[PDB]
Amino acid sequence: MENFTTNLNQLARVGGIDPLIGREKELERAIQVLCRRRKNNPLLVGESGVGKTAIAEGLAWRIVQGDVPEVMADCTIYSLDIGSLLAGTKYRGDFEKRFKALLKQLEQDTNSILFIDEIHTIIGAGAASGGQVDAANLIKPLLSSGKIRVIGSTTYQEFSNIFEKDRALARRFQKIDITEPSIEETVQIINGLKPKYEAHHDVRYTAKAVRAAVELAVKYINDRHLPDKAIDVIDEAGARARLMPVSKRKKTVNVADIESVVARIARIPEKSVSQSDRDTLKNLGDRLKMLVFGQDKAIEALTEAIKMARAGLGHEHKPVGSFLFAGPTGVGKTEVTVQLSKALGIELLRFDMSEYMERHTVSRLIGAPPGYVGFDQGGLLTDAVIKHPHAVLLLDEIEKAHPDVFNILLQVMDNGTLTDNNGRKADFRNVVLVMTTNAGVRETERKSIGLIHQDNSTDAMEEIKKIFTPEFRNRLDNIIWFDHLSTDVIHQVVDKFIVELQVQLDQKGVSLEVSQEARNWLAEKGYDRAMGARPMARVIQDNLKKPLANELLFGSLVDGGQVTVALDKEKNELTYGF
């Protein structure tokens, strides 16, 4: 035992193991179990990071501090490192001699408790031959006879998958469920532990820093439990603050440092909103109007959703915003979204919904159910939002997906979550959801029969309503109708496309000038309300790019020249040059 276990009273008394705060009921049972006539061995079972070891060792602390029932007073708790019982072995029989020697020592002390953490690891030692499991074979009678007292500890999952197969062991200890504290209990736990962080990091925490670490961690960090989750924030903020005095920036850790740390851990930005990001955001609405012409209202809706979220007036558990972009083809429905993600500097997660035409294609978004082929793959959607929690999520031509696929978004739009096939949750609260569609267009573009042409603008009233179930629609922030582009827009579109052409040419060392007459001509020639801005690229392709490709490819316009294009008036034909 001398070099296999740790005397926890000795440790708790001299170095300290950090105080245990609260957990009155947890200890009440542990003691009542330890006080039983037989099988007086509690097992602390729970979610990782809830204080299972904190309690098991915390008991040693209470004993050395005298804060125990006299029954427990003066008893010694020893923690066993089973790794050391194997490190000292090699051939047959040495393990058992060593293992039993420790048991004899516990029996001889008579007033001691052994603590075995990771209790599910006591299964082992036997190998090659085996059948002698250690875990049960060397201790079943020790536990059932009351000769020794053992406190164990385990993760709830390990407990059911491993620590629960051996019924004989399952029967020999009393399980105590350690659940995670609530907000207040977490705050008091921090206050009790706080002096150790302040002492370790040479920092001090404000009342708000502590209050906030708990509330913020709960809201933003969701893969850990409260008592160790809020601590990471406090400890991390401490470690960060400790790196300031290096430039003499000695300071108290305040709520501002906590928010910076939570924001970094959760990858959700929070303080830059007060800095230059105010202008990046302020100007967002206009940068996008230089890329998508017309459609200002779509730009505003996106811009507004983002501003509210950055302002802090977002929702508590919804995507940044979620609206469907409907309209005629070639009007900037996907273009504004692509540009939004560029303007914001964030990842664009683009899915083509045309690929999800069968009901069973949902498995590509979620992953196969356990037990199936594609299980370890995970889901493509849930994974995309996990790697990039701050993103623009674009679902192109959503009306092409099998309609049951839309059901996947009900919980996304409403709770910001989606659960993958491993049970992990996607978190969409920092994702802008944009879905585009051509629903209703075929109808809006149809001519009616009669003397008076009917106004078919109520496409929203039929196709959008028939396609998207009421519960889907009632979760959208908006349904935004993109219009056909006007001729004023076409002129802007043509200018835009010519610039794109100029850039491709600049990269080849040549440049292009187009006269205004030539531009107006191309705009006038290509406009077709029905196809939006889509054909303008073809008009440019035929009137400017084809001529240029011949000049670029066969030597007429290569190194040494530039091309000027002008329109004549007689034929309205374009000129070219060098």
Ligand X SMILES: Nc1ncnc2c1ncn2[C@@H]1O[C@H](COP(=O)(O)OP(=O)(O)OP(=O)(O)O)[C@@H](O)[C@H]1O
Interface residues with ligand X (CB under 6 A) are 18, 20-23, 48-54, 58, 155, 168, 171, 189, 227-228, 231, 292-295, 329-335, 436, 438, 471, 474, 485, 489, 493, 496, 532-534, 537
Taking the least distance from each CB to ligand X, the nearer of 36 and 171 is 171
Which of the choices its own copies, ligand X, none does residue 294 contact, using the CB cut-off of 5 to 8 A by kind?
ligand X
Q: Which of 51, 181, 238, 526 binds its own copies (CB under 8 A)?
A: 238
Give the shortest CB-217-to-its own copies separation in angstroms. 13
Under the binding rule (CB under 8 A), the answer on residue 529 touching its own copies is: no
53 has binding-site annotation: yes
Pick out residues in 67-86 that bind its own copies (CB under 8 A): 69-71, 81-84, 86
Taking the least distance from each CB to ligand X, the nearer of 39 and 98 is 39
327 has binding-site annotation: yes
Under the binding rule (CB under 8 A), the answer on residue 424 touching its own copies is: yes
Residue 226, amino acid: L
* 137's tokens: 């074979």
48 has binding-site annotation: yes
Classify residue 125 as left (phi > 0), alpha (psi -120 to 50) or beta. Answer: left
Q: CA-based angle 200:202:205, to the nearest 5?
A: 100
Which of the choices its own copies, ligand X, none does residue 160 contact, using the CB cut-off of 5 to 8 A by kind?
its own copies
Which of the choices its own copies, ligand X, none does residue 578 contact, using the CB cut-off of 5 to 8 A by kind?
none
Under the binding rule (CB under 8 A), the answer on residue 448 touching its own copies is: no
- CA quadruple 485, 486, 490, 492: dihedral positive or negative? negative
Q: Which of 13, 147, 194, 196 binds its own copies (CB under 8 A)?
A: 196
Which of the choices its own copies, ligand X, none does residue 189 contact, using the CB cut-off of 5 to 8 A by kind?
ligand X
Under the binding rule (CB under 8 A), the answer on residue 244 touching its own copies is: no
Under the binding rule (CB under 8 A), the answer on residue 38 touching its own copies is: yes
Residue 270, amino acid: E
Give the shortest CB-188-to-ligand X separation in angstroms. 9
Taking the least distance from each CB to its own copies, the nearer of 36 and 454 is 36
CA distance 21 to 24: 9
The tokens 């230059």 sit on which residue?
Answer: 276
- Please name which of 119, 123, 183, 172 lies closest in space to residue 146, comparing C-alpha atoms: 172
Size of the site for its own copies (CB under 8 A): 186
Residue 532 and residue 484 in contact, taking contact as beta carbons nearer than 8 Å: yes
Under the binding rule (CB under 8 A), the answer on residue 553 touching its own copies is: yes
- Please name which of 72, 85, 45 lies closest in space to residue 149, comparing C-alpha atoms: 72
Name the DSSP letter for residue 354. Answer: G
Give the shortest CB-344-to-its own copies separation in angstroms. 13
CA distance 177 to 175: 6
Under the binding rule (CB under 8 A), the answer on residue 14 touching its own copies is: no
Residue nearest to ligand X (CB): 53
Which of the choices its own copies, ligand X, none does residue 304 contact, using the CB cut-off of 5 to 8 A by kind?
its own copies
273 has binding-site annotation: no
Element (H, E) at 155: strand 149-155
CA distance 193 to 205: 12
Taking the least distance from each CB to ligand X, the nearer of 166 and 277 is 166
CA distance 48 to 223: 10
329 has binding-site annotation: yes
Pick out residues in 91-150 that bind its own copies (CB under 8 A): 91-97, 99-101, 117-118, 120-121, 123-133, 137-138, 140-141, 144
Residue 334 and residue 348 in contact, taking contact as beta carbons nearer than 8 Å: no
Question: Residue 81: what are its φ and ψ, rounded to 5°?
Answer: -95, 100
Print the binding letters for residues 200-219 with its own copies: x by CB under 8 A, - otherwise. Answer: xx------------------
Give the shortest CB-464-to-its own copies separation in angstroms. 14
Pairing of β 5-7 and β 76-80: antiparallel
CA distance 532 to 525: 13
Residues 6+ apart with CB under 8 A from 115: 8, 56, 57, 77, 78, 79, 80, 150, 151, 152, 153
User: HSE on the CB side for 238, CA within 13 Å?
Assistant: 23
- Binding positions are 46-53, 327-334
- Binding positions for ATP are 46-53, 327-334
